[PDB]
Amino acid sequence: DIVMTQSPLTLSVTIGQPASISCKSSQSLLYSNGKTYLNWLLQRPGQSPKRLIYLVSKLESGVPDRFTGSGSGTDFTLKISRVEAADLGVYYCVQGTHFPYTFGGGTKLEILRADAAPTVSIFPPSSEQLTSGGASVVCFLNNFYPKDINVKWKIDGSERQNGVLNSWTDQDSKDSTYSMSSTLTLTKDEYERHNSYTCEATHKTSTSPIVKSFNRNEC
Amino acid sequence: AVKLQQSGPELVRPGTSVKLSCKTSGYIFTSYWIHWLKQSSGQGLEWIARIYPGTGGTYYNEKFKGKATLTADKSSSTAYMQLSSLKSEDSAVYFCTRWGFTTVRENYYAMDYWGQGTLVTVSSAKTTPPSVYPLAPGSAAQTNSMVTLGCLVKGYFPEPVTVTWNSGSLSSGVHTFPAVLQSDLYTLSSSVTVPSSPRPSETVTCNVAHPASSTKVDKKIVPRDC
Numbered sequence: 328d329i330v331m332t333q334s335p336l337t338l339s340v341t342i343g344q345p346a347s348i349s350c351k352s353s354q355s356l357l358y359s360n361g362k363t364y365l366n367w368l369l370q371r372p373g374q375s376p377k378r379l380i381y382l383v384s385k386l387e388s389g390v391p392d393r394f395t396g397s398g399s400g401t402d403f404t405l406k407i408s409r410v411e412a413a414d415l416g417v418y419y420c421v422q423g424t425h426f427p428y429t430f431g432g433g434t435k436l437e438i439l440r441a442d443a444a445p446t447v448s449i450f451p452p453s454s455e456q457l458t459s460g461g462a463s464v465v466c467f468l469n470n471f472y473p474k475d476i477n478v479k480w481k482i483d484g485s486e487r488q489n490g491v492l493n494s495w496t497d498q499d500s501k502d503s504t505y506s507m508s509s510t511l512t513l514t515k516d517e518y519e520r521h522n523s524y525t526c527e528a529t530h531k532t533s534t535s536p537i538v539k540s541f542n543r544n545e546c
Numbered sequence: 547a548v549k550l551q552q553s554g555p556e557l558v559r560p561g562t563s564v565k566l567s568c569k570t571s572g573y574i575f576t577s578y579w580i581h582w583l584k585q586s587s588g589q590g591l592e593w594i595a596r597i598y599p600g601t602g603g604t605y606y607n608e609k610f611k612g613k614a615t616l617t618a619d620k621s622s623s624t625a626y627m628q629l630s631s632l633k634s635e636d637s638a639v640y641f642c643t644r645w646g647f648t649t650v651r652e653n654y655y656a657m658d659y660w661g662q663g664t665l666v667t668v669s670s671a672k673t674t675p676p677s678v679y680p681l682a683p684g685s686a687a688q689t690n691s692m693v694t695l696g697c698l699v700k701g702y703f704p705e706p707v708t709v710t711w712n713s714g715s716l717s718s719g720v721h722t723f724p725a726v727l728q729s730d731l732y733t734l735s736s737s738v739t740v741p742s743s744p745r746p747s748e749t750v751t752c753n754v755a756h757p758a759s760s761t762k763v764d765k766k767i768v769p770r771d772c
């Protein structure tokens with residue numbers, strides 16, 4: 328029971344700027360004792376949730392003076408004055424005034440950082456894999472910002488071939504870059520017919536520089 | 547030092563049952579309530595139940611009444627939660643925590659401590675061990691200053707796999723990318739950037755362990771001899 332509604336769904340903040348997550352509730356959260364049981368949780372990438380503010384405005388031991396708990400009636404607000412890289416996470420609000428304690432849907436914070444070019448690394452299929460009749464050429468693109476980057480696979484001087492699969496990581500809450508791994512998986516046949524394989528990376532737009540490549544046979 | 551340790555990744559066939567565990571240490575077990583949470587996709591963060599080990603008194607969120615059951619073992623300081631008649635809807639990550647709330651009257655909050663979590667996958671599909679492939683560079687040399695190595699854990703089910711380098715004795719610089727479900731089968735990879743000082747000479751081993759299939763694979767990343 329009780330519906331907690333959070334907004335925005337996600338939000339980008341340039342380190343140094345403030346942010347305001349909102350949490351509206353479906354009922355009043357004031358208890359007989361005149362207490363309002365509303366807490367704010369964090370949960371950084373790869374960790375469990377952690378309590379930040381209890382009783383609407385009470386900072387927990389360790390929480391920075393930059394966080395501010397507030398609200399009244401059914402409207403609640405968490406304010407961050409100066410956003411630091413370490414505040415990356417998915418903030419949640421929990422009402423404890425009515426038995427079935429309920430949470431908000433979380434608001435994902437994204438640290439807006441200055442542009443940064445990646446470090447490409449391409450790897451030829453392992454001989455071990457080739458004996459099973461498949462071939463996955465891997466290219467690791469890491470330590471970059473913004474997120475969405477364009478990776479191009481040019482087999483034997485031409486376009487793509489035999490479908491690519493991509494995967495990014497969470498922003499580093501220490502620095503604020505990303506990392507992606509692009510895997511080109513061809514069958515043994517197709518691999519054994521072409522010899523030059525390249526991995527280009529277009530920083531958002533333009534003609535793709537930042538190229539790494541190897542040559543089959545001559546390896 | 548307060549520590550809450552949870553059970554490992556469970557893979558269960560529908561309709562059956564599992565029992566998770568939360569082992570406490572560092573604090574006085576029976577003097578605090580232990581809460582259990584569900585973090586599912588879509589659904590997302592639901593409060594399940596709580597237990598006071600001292601008196602053995604429980605409280606259940608109406609929505610999970612008859613699905614979950616809590617208990618505690620005083621001697622071992624371990625709390626358990628049991629999930630009956632599992633369904634696809636039950637697959638998620640469950641947490642246990644020493645929330646720290648007292649009573650409406652004390653209105654005091656002891657520092658919360660959370661367990662790491664337990665991935666529970668309700669499925670009928672057969673388990674499939676991963677295929678580890680050691681990926682080494684070549685040509686006119688690759689990664690000049692720092693060299694990046696890699697490991698490709700291909701075609702397994704279900705998640706998770708636990709990739710590590712030199713058994714944890716190589717922690718700084720590792721990158722692990724999310725597994726992406728392709729043909730009802732996962733694939734993930736990881737990189738490790740080590741200076742060139744220890745690449746040619748000095749061993750590097752990618753160790754992947756697949757809990758759901760009691761499997762362990764050690765791949766010594768070797769250079770190219772051609």
Ligand SMILES: O=C(O)CNC(=O)CCCP(=O)(O)OCc1ccc([N+](=O)[O-])cc1
Nearest residue numbers: 364366421422423424426428581643645647
């Ligand atoms: O139980 C009731 O009937 C009376 N109301 C209360 O006791 C208020 C409880 C305050 P609080 O400790 O915030 O309880 C809600 C609450 C409990 C656990 C949690 N969690 O993340 O584990 C998040 C929220």
